[PDB]
From Swiss-Prot, chains A, B:
Keywords: DNA-binding, Plasmid, Repressor, Transcription, Transcription regulation
Domain HTH tetR-type: 1-60
Subunit architecture: Homodimer. Binds cooperatively to DNA as a pair of dimers.
Family annotation (Pfam families): TetR_C_5, TetR_N
Gene of this entry: qacR
Keyword Ribonucleoprotein annotated: no
This protein's record includes keyword Oxidoreductase: no
The protein's name in its UniProt record: HTH-type transcriptional regulator QacR
DNA-binding region, residue range(s): 23-42
PROSITE patterns (alphabetical): HTH_TETR_1, HTH_TETR_2
GO MF annotations in UniProt: DNA binding; DNA-binding transcription factor activity
Length: 186, 186
């Protein structure tokens, strides 16, 4: 719980001041813990952050599990999962901390190892869709693993670098992408 | 020179270190200059950045012209563009700094002028390609501007969120994408 409290407090601080501005001092002092207990649970700020990301990751996966009930077929799932990514990220509180963190340790192979396992989970979602799609003749894909990585990265770019138009138009583009990409399969 | 050494050290900084991580101070310190010269064309960190950006975009659009000839059919122009994006040393190595910058100075307006101008050269390459493809009957797109934006961003996603894994796999993935995207256009 002292650990859970650290995670909880830390999260709010990152949300409030981004990754860089947040100090383990604050986290310690605000969660009424100690540098010693923090170091024992996470060693470094980098790591602490990574765990929070892991936890958020599971919340997302859990939200998806419930949200996909609105999408019957796998082609629909693809449409919905992308839509979701776009909208949720628009107002995700940690988004800012993530950017900071990401663009700081993406050069360091150390803090890039754990980051991979995390991203893979995110891709996994797609792997599932395309695979279940094969068992339903919605499409026939030779190597799911490749397409999955492609969709995941193409969708995120469309999400990250689109920042400029009204959310309404964004969805339209995102859905157009789904349409096209799903059509480039078959 | 002076004004150029700025854009130089500034660029080298914006890439290696993040956007926020780089400051006017670090400049003059490694640029051996003053903190006042920054004003005639550099009204703020933004303009200095939005400037270096535009410059690099040009550096990239230049290489593209000198090399696009290797591709005959527009279907090839598309593939070559996306492949080159992965190997260039222009503009793309700043996407990080860019993301970051888009989560801070995206409220002001006096900047969104130089901004959108640059977001044009970004999708223009695709506008030409797709359009010239409508003539040669290589495909039929009745919404070039949309598809253009979609592709530019999708591709940018692939370049950016893979910069850490085998450059060979990168090219492989990128081409597998171009194939699918194009195959989904008709
Ligand atoms: C809040 N939310 C749902 C999400 C939040 C972030 C991501 C991201 C990402 C991009 C490409 C990935 N791939 C394909 C390796 C994995 C993750 C991501 C976006 C910007 C910077 C770093 C990573 C995804 C979903």
């Amino acid at each position: 719980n002292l650990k859970d409290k650290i995670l909880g407090v830390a999260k709010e601080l990152f949300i409030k001041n981004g990754y860089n501005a947040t100090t383990t001092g604050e986290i310690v002092k605000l969660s009424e813990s100690s540098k010693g207990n923090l170091y024992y649970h996470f060693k470094t700020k980098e790591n602490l952050f990574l765990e929070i990301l892991n936890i958020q990751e599971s919340k997302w996966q859990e939200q998806w599990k419930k949200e996909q009930i609105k999408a019957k077929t796998n082609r629909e799932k693809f449409y919905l999962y992308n839509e979701l990514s776009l909208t949720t990220e628009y107002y995700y509180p940690l988004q800012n901390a993530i950017i900071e963190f990401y663009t700081e340790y993406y050069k360091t192979n150390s803090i890039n190892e754990k980051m991979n396992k995390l991203e893979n989970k995110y891709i996994d979602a797609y792997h599932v869709i395309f695979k279940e799609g094969n068992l339903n003749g919605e499409w026939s894909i030779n190597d799911v693993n490749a397409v999955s990585k492609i969709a995941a990265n193409a969708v995120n770019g469309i999400v990250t670098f689109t920042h400029e138009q009204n959310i309404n138009e964004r969805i339209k583009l995102m859905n157009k992408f789904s349409q096209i990409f799903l059509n480039g399969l078959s």
